[PDB]
Amino acid sequence: NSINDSKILSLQNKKNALVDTSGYNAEVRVGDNVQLNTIYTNDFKLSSSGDKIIVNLNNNIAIYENSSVSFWIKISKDLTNSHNEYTIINSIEQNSGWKLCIRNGNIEWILQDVNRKYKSLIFDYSESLSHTGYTNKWFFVTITNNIMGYMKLYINGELKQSQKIEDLDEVKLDKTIVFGIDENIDENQMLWIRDFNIFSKELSNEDINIVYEGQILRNVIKDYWGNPLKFDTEYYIINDNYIDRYIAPESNVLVLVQYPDRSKLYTGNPITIKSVSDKNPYSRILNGDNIILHMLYNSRKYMIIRDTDTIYACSQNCVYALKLQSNLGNYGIGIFSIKNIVSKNKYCSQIFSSFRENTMLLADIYKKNAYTPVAVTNYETKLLSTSSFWKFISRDPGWVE
């Protein structure tokens, strides 16, 4: 493909080292404390004001104008708050070149000439720590530079800025790239980056989306943060429509109780996902996989199941409540399947059941009144209702509360 062929720097993990696999042999030095391949194959973590990754390019890279840079990034909550400014990726020798900075929930791409004049492409990824923002969530970033004099900023394949190289003169580029944060930070101030690639051309919006779609791993279910969802892992399962409500037994039926404190995220009864078929413990959940949900409630685990009887006292558009069952096992009544929803700003999925009648899970109020998760038949019409979207919140080191 023409896109890969353009790669002049590709940071990937091979044996157990982060190396350049572009073929141009750039030198890569990884600090001792730097953690690699913890969530995604080619990821790396940057934290405690020190440990860094140093990339030294070679003469192989015929210098020019047109070029592109892509990578995914996940920034911890404690780090997105700090009003302080942080440089995370630096490629500036004296005062010329580029660097990537984060400042108060904002990611900023800086390009400055020899006169020390810069332009900057900015993006508010946090947007007031909105649970609909990207704090501590993986998002795909792409920067492109061209001859006409335009540098654009893309977030998840969507153009967000674009500015022309005007008051910008000569921009000397050095053979070195430094990844890290030297400024003293908390033990909880951290961030992750994966699939860092440098391109020799100006990727087209279409080209960018092809890379995005390929690196997001479409067949892998994702947790709330964009990390792959895993079997035998604790998750606070929430409905997309009701981010501040937690699943609870309440009255012989599962319901969604309001978070006593909306500012908190980690609230409720942790649910573990088990595979019906035999798969290694904490392996990745893929869409189409059959699963079982165990809810931990008062020192005991229960299997979430679909009620056999309808919500009231059916023939078409039937509504079934969800319940807890003590006897654990591969009971078809508790067997569900899961599938990713394609969406540029939401890591969620749909849950289905093929027990006796094909149903899909959704949350709504029907009936004194209460928000209830239910399984409903003849749901084609609802495949795009956000009420059938579920998110799985894992306790992540990037969000401490």
Residue 387 contacts residue 376 (beta carbons within 8 Å): no
Alpha-carbon gap, residue 285 to 279, rounded angstroms: 10
323 is in an annotated binding site: yes
Burial 267-304 (b: 16+ CB within 10 A, else e): bbbbbbbbbbeeeeeeebbbbebbbbbbbebeeeebbb
Strand partners, 197: 10, 70
Backbone break loci in the chain, preceding residues, C–N > 2.5 A: 61, 313, 367
Contact partners, residue 336, CB within 8 Å, separation at least 6 = 290, 291, 292, 293, 351, 352, 353, 361
Of 310, 288, 301, 293, nearest to 354 (Cα)?
A: 288
- Letter for the amino acid at 161? Q
309 is in an annotated binding site: yes
Binding residues: 308-309, 323
> Which residues are known binding-site members for N-acetyl-beta-neuraminate?
308-309, 323
